[PDB]
Design a protein around this ligand. Sequence first.
Ligand SMILES: Nc1nc2c(ncn2[C@@H]2O[C@H](COP(=O)(O)OP(=O)(O)OP(=O)(O)O)[C@@H](O)[C@H]2O)c(=O)[nH]1
Ligand SMILES: Nc1nc2c(ncn2[C@@H]2O[C@H](COP(=O)(O)OP(=O)(O)O)[C@@H](O)[C@H]2O)c(=O)[nH]1
Ligand SMILES: [Mg+2]
Lengths: 49, 36, 107, 426, 429
Amino acid sequence: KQKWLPPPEATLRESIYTSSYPRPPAGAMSRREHAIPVPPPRLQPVPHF
Amino acid sequence: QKLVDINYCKKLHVEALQRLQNQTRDQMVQNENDDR
Amino acid sequence: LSSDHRTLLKSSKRSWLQEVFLTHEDSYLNCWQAAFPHPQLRLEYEGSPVPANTKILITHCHTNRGLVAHRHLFLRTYFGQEAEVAAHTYLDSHRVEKPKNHWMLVT
Amino acid sequence: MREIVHLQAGQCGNQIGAKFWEVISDEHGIDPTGTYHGDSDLQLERINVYYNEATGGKYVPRAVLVDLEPGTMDSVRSGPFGQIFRPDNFVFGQSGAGNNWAKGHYTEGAELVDSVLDVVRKEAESCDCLQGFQLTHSLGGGTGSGMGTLLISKIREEYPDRIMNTFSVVPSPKVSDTVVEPYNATLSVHQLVENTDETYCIDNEALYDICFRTLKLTTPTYGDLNHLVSATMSGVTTCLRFPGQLNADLRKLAVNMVPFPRLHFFMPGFAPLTSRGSQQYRALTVPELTQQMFDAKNMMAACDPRHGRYLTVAAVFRGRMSMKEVDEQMLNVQNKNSSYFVEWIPNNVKTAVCDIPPRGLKMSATFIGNSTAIQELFKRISEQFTAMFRRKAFLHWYTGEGMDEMEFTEAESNMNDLVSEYQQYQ
Amino acid sequence: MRECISVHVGQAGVQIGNACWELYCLEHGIQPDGQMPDDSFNTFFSETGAGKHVPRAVFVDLEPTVIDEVRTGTYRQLFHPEQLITGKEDAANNYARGHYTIGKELIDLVLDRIRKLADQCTGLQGFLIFHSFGGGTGSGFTSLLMERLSVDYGKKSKLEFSIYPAPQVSTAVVEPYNSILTTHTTLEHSDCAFMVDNEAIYDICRRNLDIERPTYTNLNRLIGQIVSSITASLRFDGALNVDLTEFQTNLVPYPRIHFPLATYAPVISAEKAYHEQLSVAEITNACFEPANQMVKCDPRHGKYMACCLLYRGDVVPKDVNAAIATIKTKRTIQFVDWCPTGFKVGINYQPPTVVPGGDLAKVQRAVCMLSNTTAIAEAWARLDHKFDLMYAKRAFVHWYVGEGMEEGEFSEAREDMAALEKDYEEVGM
Ligand SMILES: Nc1nc2c(ncn2[C@@H]2O[C@H](COP(=O)(O)OP(=O)(O)OP(=O)(O)O)[C@@H](O)[C@H]2O)c(=O)[nH]1
Ligand SMILES: Nc1nc2c(ncn2[C@@H]2O[C@H](COP(=O)(O)OP(=O)(O)O)[C@@H](O)[C@H]2O)c(=O)[nH]1
Ligand SMILES: [Mg+2]
């Protein structure tokens, strides 16, 4: 029945980049559990030579 | 006989066109209005 | 009251001209505009108010075609009373509008 | 950015250039005062391919509409869509040719080309990067068949890289409108092969054998027949005007359809054609837009390729699906009718995807078929041109207009051999 | 300091650079405005004194109606205005159009903008190049970029990941001539070179996932799931790390042989993976069975001659090494004799990130094998077989000659392929 009857379909005029690439929700973003912590600055050649 | 073949092909071309138009489609419109 | 630009699948019932129908939605294919039949005076009549029972042409705003009555082909209904409506502007050899297209909005 | 500057010629040229600019005007939402009252803003992005700009929101086309008597442009100025063309762009003469090549090729045509060659340099130069031009005329008149072949021969010399297409009208082979219409046709064709990039072929009983049998009609006007050849005519420039996954344009189809510059003779078609009472009774799906194209009824030439070979085959799709289920039909059709393609190409079917459908419709497709089924089309001109010229019929209309009989003789040898050039690949 | 400046060329460039650069915005913590709502972004994003994160990417096309859409829609303020390069006309399924005439006025604006990003990166590891042989910009301009990339940087790392044409279907006709003649330039000008074929992702997405009737976007997501595992170790911590220099070191034994494959193991739907165990054995079995690859050619005719493994998430080194010792022994798989050990492993802690609107589930283990083999000698065989089937009648060649080009490239690009077709059984033996 959801395949038979349509959605209201103002999406007839739709580029796939608009439909297939919308804005995702604000909470589905990945938590970086395993990442080298940045509070202590990483080992970098701060001698500029 | 060669012109017989040419005349036969010409008449069947134009005559197939006229049959396929009128006597096979005017009956179609009459059939649909009659059935409605 | 609506009518769309003619396509190859959207044609009227008996005649196959531009068809006119009824729909629920709101658009710009719903807006009509009414003008004068005498063709040398409509540019002088572009802003005058319209009297009630006078013969005025009705035309669309997107197609610029006009609503017509076909007194020549009949629609048998339940009520038995018959005609056809469409939208196609008609003009003569003198190039004025025929009596087919005149409409009156009576009160 | 890219533009298409549009050429028309005559009574064929103006009763087709009145309806092609009706379908485009419904496509981008254009009312007959110029302005825009459309819904979205995909309907205003690439509008500059066809429409110029003016005061306010006015969009007046890039149209060149030409005849040699103004009894044809008196109608097209006075239709519903007659206030949309700019009034300078009609070019009209005084005394027309009227079913004679030479009158509108040297006498009346060649003195009229010096104002049409000003209205194209005023208007091709306005465009930024013009893609090319289109023409749509008939090979059976004297306006487009003589002078339109004289603008083809005299616009390829100023701009020799921009595109040149022709929606030509070749003779109807069975029932014909004019006696001397072979003479107008066969002298245009030799003038057509050397100065045209790609050529369609639009016949009028090829339209009659659709609308009789496929749309079930019994009052088919030309105003019906001009929809069938403007549904395709805007069905080739889709991906310029609308995005997709995979795009194309007029340049990229002829790249895959002209193996050699003597070989650009197509035959077009159109998928979703059903009646109005046979309308709801079919699901509008992918295989039911490609079961119809390869059938021997849909094509807009009056020539059947079961005798011949599909040399190369094009496709341009609309609607938000041409991705995997079109790729199991284009794989199916290359395997089932396995003797209708020639060996010496890897594969023949080209593909583009526009995602926006035609208005009021869900899905579509359009055909451009380079074939060896046009060498049976040019033989029914030169089996009636040699059934006319041995008895020197109607010839006094031509030798007294400045031509000569060798020019008639030359258009035999350069079209008898072009059939003998096509004939090997079968 | 671990930068990886991406190059994407074409309509395979930007439809892939949209999907690849959508994953990284959710792999790290990036709003599509560019802001954030612990430093892994320094490979791809760059900073400002306002918190904005602009990617180190170039999108190149010769057609405005592919890149005038990415600058129109959702991910709009993320990309710099000048990082996306557009022509004015398209090279239209051709070589010389892309290589000589039209490619010569977009070779200059790109090399100003490659130089501006590369001057910003201190420890730039190397460029990534993704394009398609099937077009004008992706196959004419791209080989022109790499002909002018080697003079500016020399031995700098430039990886390939091309969209080769499929062996059964193809979108076009004259497409072999672009596919043949790109390899005469991309042999001396390519470090490592992956391959995919879109029909070999069409059948996977309908079989190994329940989603039939896809678009290229549902093919673009799995292509962007290879690339995360390629740069997996450079941003997130690992028990063993890999790097950009490591792939060509252990997969390119000879500099005329730089053609790995690509295969992604746990391709199972959001429901069908939720009801079955997915152990490290049960993902390394998928990458060796010949119905799961990202190419349409079986290595049962071929010999695996170098390998590489990548791992994600819930992996233990014990169970990695228990299932390796099985697939060494089975005789459905054989190696060449001259590679004695034939592996490289690399373990990344971070599990992969689910894309909203995709077709894969929350998983814990994954494998991205890159196993070069001798079964690409049946890929250049078919791209030759239909090239001398059609060069015998000179079937399209006039398009190419009058476009700033000469004729003699065709008669040497096939004779270049003849040597490289003879190279792959001398090494293969
Ligand atoms: N897997 C995958 N394949 C793609 C994608 N986009 C395009 N392709 C393939 O890439 C080829 C497209 O050619 P184009 O990229 O349009 O050529 P181009 O680079 O735009 O240059 P032109 O010749 O001007 O068109 C076709 O073979 C497509 O099947 C994509 O996003 N994903
Ligand atoms: N399909 C189609 N054919 C047309 C149209 N107008 C005229 N023709 C055909 O064109 C032929 C006559 O054209 P003609 O008047 O000689 O063209 P012109 O003199 O060059 O302007 C006839 O065979 C008509 O059937 C049209 O609008 N559509
Ligand atoms: Mg492009």
